[PDB]
Amino acid sequence: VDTCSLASPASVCRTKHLHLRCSVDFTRRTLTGTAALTVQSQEDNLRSLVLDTKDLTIEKVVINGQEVKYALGERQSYKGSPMEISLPIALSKNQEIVIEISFETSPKSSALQWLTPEQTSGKEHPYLFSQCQAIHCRAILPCQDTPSVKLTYTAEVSVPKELVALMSAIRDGETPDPEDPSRKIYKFIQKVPIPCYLIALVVGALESRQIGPRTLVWSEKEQVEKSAYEFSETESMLKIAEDLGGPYVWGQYDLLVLPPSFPYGGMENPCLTFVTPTLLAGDKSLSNVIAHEISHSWTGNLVTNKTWDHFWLNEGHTVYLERHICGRLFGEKFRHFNALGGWGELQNSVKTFGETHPFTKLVVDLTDIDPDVAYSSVPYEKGFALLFYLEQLLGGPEIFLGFLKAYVEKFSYKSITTDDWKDFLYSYFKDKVDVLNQVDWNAWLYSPGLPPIKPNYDMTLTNACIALSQRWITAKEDDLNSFNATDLKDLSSHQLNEFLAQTLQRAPLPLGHIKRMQEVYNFNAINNSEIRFRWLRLCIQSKWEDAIPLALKMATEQGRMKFTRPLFKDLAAFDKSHDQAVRTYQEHKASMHPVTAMLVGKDLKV
Ligand SMILES: Nc1cc(-c2ccc(Oc3ccc(Cl)cc3)cc2)[nH]n1
Ligand SMILES: [Zn+2]
């Protein structure tokens, strides 16, 4: 049923537990060790099984202290190579065996980026971080690389004693390596069953600062103190999340601020969220990303999508919870602001993808499609639009939040499909079934382009952005002298960002407008990467050669694909910077994140 995994489906067998013993070698850029997988059979007379692997080196497979026959199949592009294992016994239904696999990752592992000391803040020690979603755990160790199987796990990672190792699990102790005095072993334990894509590792000279009863903030010493401040409200947001979705079951909620090449804004790794360092805007304005990763602790990590065709169930509900968290902290008016802004983003994605593009469908068919290529904000906003529309259609946020909490408890620790979600919706809202039948489910779930109906959005906080953006778009020459910094006197960082987004859509603007806009607003001096990103896009799309070097620096000084990809594609579309953009990519391609370096290459057609 999962077209992205080459392993035995959950209907044949399930991995119950993973015991990982491994060592990080920065000299060769490999993890070597063993992966003991406790696997339970789901059928009678099970005599062999298949795992997922991608660029792994297998030494042997030991079962009950004896080596066993295994075979690796031909590689299937991004899916990797399937690994068959011959069992030393035939397992009847629900019986279990432990399989010990001696493996070693490839330096080209698509799940990891190896950073040289100069690629870090401290410039003295190397760095390693993982990114498994969607199907990259197979590039770290053999497993059923599919969200349809959930497993607990325990790990022991040997690392140079000067470094620290962290995982998506509770820290369970550290000691000097008994077989190597120059190394330390960090132990971890994750008692809540998870999909293997939530497995994460990080190794580096990490410092910590406690910002809450169950929250530490991790980063290099240069950024720890800044990050502890930027995210001071995490505990504040955890209690709101708990009130909406129920108890937080993962014990610890730590935060990890990675080096600038991290490919995404955040990764909802259990116990240790990964976030881009580009959130350090200095005013906490971009902290809603933390509210997002927090919400994933219920929608996504507790209730998980069965395949990646149903990824929208994860981010769709997560965005919904996030904007309710922000609404409880800043008012319902603010919640509608983000919802409306998100609907504007959904317009941008569709315009860029195309109204008929298959990647604008809510439920996709990733058969023979690299899930990384399908990743976009469409499942985020299109998913949220559906839930918001249902919230309004079903009687308000109070009623619908009651459904969300029940939905989470109903499928806790399980993996569901869109039909599972829809089926329980009709069960929960059995009194209003006739209202649900008014919904165009076929169009919402499987038709591409923008949804069939637009929700009702409060225009209060957005009106200020619309007035100013309209003045610039419709302004002629004689109107440019009157623009002044006072236009932003009562605008927040978010409103400033929305204004740019509103202006960005109607780009390009006359060259004089862009030059005047820099004179009066000085967007070049704003550190907020969301705002800077859009201001730069507005400049390059308007053919302003002065913004070329500023955009190349931001596209390469950080690796968040949200910014790096559009900036490059825009530089490649500008005639005056096409050559410089391509040449720049070729140079940095070798030291970019593997997933990021592959995608920009496709964007650039190199
Ligand atoms: N409009 C849409 C888009 C999708 C979609 C489904 C699966 C995907 O795989 C992933 C998920 C997360 C990451 Cl980090 C990388 C790849 C991406 C996107 N579903 N519906
Ligand atoms: Zn997310």
Curated annotation (Swiss-Prot):
Disulfide bonds: none annotated. Changing D372N: Abolishes aminopeptidase activity. Decreased epoxide hydrolase activity. Its cofactor is Zn(2+). The modification Phosphoserine is found at S412. Inhibited by bestatin. The epoxide hydrolase activity is restrained by suicide inactivation that involves binding of LTA4 to Tyr-375. 4-(4-benzylphenyl)thiazol-2-amine (ARM1) selectively inhibits the epoxide hydrolase activity. Isoform 1 and isoform 2 are expressed in monocytes, lymphocytes, neutrophils, reticulocytes, platelets and fibroblasts. The modification N6-acetyllysine is found at K69, K333, K410, K569. This is Leukotriene A-4 hydrolase. The lineage of its organism: Eukaryota, Metazoa, Chordata, Craniata, Vertebrata.
